[PDB]
């Protein structure tokens, strides 16, 4: 079972964690792997080689934080390292559904793609709903005065805090709780890699929570969004005969009454028995003329071709 390991960033001082993050930046994803990179790839490593790379302080920080365990003659990690978009990120390894713990954390299935879709603006306060590993909060940190990540998964909150500390971030904080309950005030930026995929209307688990998590999200967006702000959502969308997703969405958002502008970029789609349709896409609220517009943009295909678009 993968996804239940204990993660305790509070056991390591800020400087040591930043130093481990600097060490990860040097080697994670590099062509010449080092013991630290091997460790964060799932390979057991010789602790003496590790000590020479990250120091005795660093070695102990790996243990104290839960980034590594001493198996006896080797160190191993339950987590996997990533370097993307100027940040380093730990998350769970990508593993089949049947072996995931209740508190398994999105192993960055779509994060790299989603960061490339995100608008380059900045502002005052940003909110990452369902922050998971924290990855999207990390990239927002440069251009928002404050970034708040929220998750109902307490292990995600700890891992997000660890990742913020690895990257040396000061303005990124995380809170455990249910949707907007821990997010006070208004935000100029809200991002949400939503836990929706093939489950339709019914909650399965924290990574496939059902259409009701989108309903809660969009019903509360207007009272949580600063005027002229931006909302960005990765979501699965189910169209049923006579009952398209976009109509329920407009109702949740109060879209016309609030004068919001919304665009849905549909990338993937699968026709369903009934002639309805399943879609995966990217939903944006941004300043513009009131209304909802739907466009086809196969950004998954383009991304597989060449990410730099
Ligand atoms: C936070 N939003 C995410 C959302 O981005 C979406 O992610 C999808 C992944 O699930 C899927 O992974 C599946 O195939 C893997 C092997 N390739 C197995 O290892 C995984 O276990 C197995 N689940 C990816 N191949 C494609 C992704 N689009 O759906 C998530 C809920 O399922 C949802 O929470
Ligand atoms: N009711 C709820 N409130 C807050 N987060 C929730 C929630 N229900 C599910 N989630 C969280 O939504 C997250 C989606 S996975 C996305 C993680 C990260 N933003 C990334 O892009 O990689 C999960 O961590 C899951 O625990
Ligand atoms: Ca599952």
UniProtKB/TrEMBL annotation:
GO terms for biological process: methylation. Pfam families: MTS. GO terms for molecular function: DNA binding; metal ion binding; S-adenosylmethionine-dependent methyltransferase activity. S-adenosyl-L-homocysteine binds at residues 151, 178-179, 193. Ca(2+) binds at residues 97, 205. Keywords: Calcium, Metal-binding, Methyltransferase, Transferase. The keyword Transferase applies. Mg(2+) binds at residues 97, 205. SUPFAM superfamilies: S-adenosyl-L-methionine-dependent methyltransferases. Residues 112-230 form the Methyltransferase small domain. This is N-3'' methyltransferase. The gene is genN.
